[PDB]
Design a protein around this ligand. Structure first.
Ligand code: EST
Ligand code: EST
Lengths: 225, 219
């Protein structure tokens, strides 16, 4: 049976999977789970994924509950032998390493900030604290791109798909003026046809956050091309 | 080209690597980085790993900066044909899925709690809040164990190595009395020869935390 993706496109790791699905032309059934309405706590979804998170993939009997496993699984099954999840061991470990940076560092910090806004309202968030935490992530990505054209080496990999969605989300709030390699790379990602899959959920996330958090992102921060 | 592991055994993900190294008899050069003195911010280590994190593995030209990548790399290089990192795709994805649960959920929540102690001091941490978050992780793992002896299936895998160290660290503070499957799994893990590599750093973490957090674990 074809893969089933439980999704809310406002989430950047969901959008990373949508980008890969578009890039490889994978036929997938989409099932919406509204994270802001709490539909991830519905009894049936909880039984399927006790972490109450999207993206969740059901592909036959395999149930994957983390975007990075979903990206690797889909690459192995639909980009067999390809370069998104490279064949050579060291290149593949480099991609894996950056997927884990996205999980453990970039997304961890973006989620900390966004959840603070939802729970507290923007006016009651220590924005400076989160600006420091997220600028630190910018600095690290800039260091990676000083030595490499894409995040994990000379060509597009799963690492770029995973990182660009969260980066575009962080950059709704924090400008990239001081980060020329990151700007160049983000601009290049924005030219990819697959990036069209990031645009709609990024904008829906912007709308939802401004309403739920009672604020406006600074329009000047987002890199637009 | 022998691997170099930058480490501080108080960190649970470091201990997961130490356990794999012992399990697989891997010859590694250890380099101590003292996280509680901020040696992870020294210019040369920061140039090597801008995330200023341990474990960091240098294996020739490859620089790995996340325990889960290190576990997979070492299994692939030193345990081809083993059950720790299964060859069969669905089995391997299942292990990978639980490794990411450890990274994204169990360790995130344990790090949030421990970070809040070191920063705010134990007396000022909202312990009930962290107890709710970390007990939720216990509940999930109890369900993962419903129809398997180990986290990812019938056999020991990298997922068990990654989870046991953080679990043993959470369990300094929160008991497993209420989780029969988790308590039995944890007790089985402690009977493995490789589990000896977890003991020293867990006790050093307790000592360091109780001193820096000015409290004592109920353990
Ligand atoms: C705020 C939540 C946690 C953080 C989530 C997040 C975190 C980061 C991000 O870039 C987008 C989102 C959208 C959904 C958010 C969730 C909606 C309910 C849940 O509380
Ligand atoms: C407290 C730090 C973050 C949380 C870290 C942690 C987080 C979880 C855990 O089980 C152990 C440790 C040991 C080192 C800790 C670090 C030493 C300084 C840093 O701030």
């Amino acid at each position: 049976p074809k893969p089933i993706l439980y999704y809310d496109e406002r989430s950047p790791p969901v959008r990373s999977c949508l980008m890969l699905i578009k890039l490889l032309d994978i036929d997938v059934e989409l099932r919406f789970v509204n994270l802001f309405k709490g539909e991830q706590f519905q009894k049936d979804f909880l039984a399927l994924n006790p972490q109450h998170s999207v993206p969740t993939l059901v592909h036959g009997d395999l149930v994957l509950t983390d975007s990075h496993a979903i990206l690797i699984h889909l690459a192995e099954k639909f980009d067999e032998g390809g370069s998104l999840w490279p064949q050579e061991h060291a290149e593949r470990m480099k991609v894996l390493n950056l997927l884990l940076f996205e999980c453990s560092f970039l997304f961890r910090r973006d989620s900390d900030f966004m959840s603070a806004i939802v729970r507290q309202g923007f006016a009651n968030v220590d924005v400076a604290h989160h600006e420091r935490k997220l600028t630190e992530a910018y600095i690290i990505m800039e260091r990676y791109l000083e030595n490499s054209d894409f995040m994990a080496g000379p060509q597009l990999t799963l690492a770029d798909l995973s990182i660009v969605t969260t980066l575009s989300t962080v950059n709704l709030m924090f400008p990239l003026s001081q980060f020329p390699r990151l700007r160049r790379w983000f601009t290049a990602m924005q030219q990819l046809d697959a990036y069209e899959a990031n645009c709609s959920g990024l904008e829906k996330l912007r709308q939802t956050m401004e309403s739920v958090g009672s604020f406006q992102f600074p329009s000047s921060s987002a890199v637009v091309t």
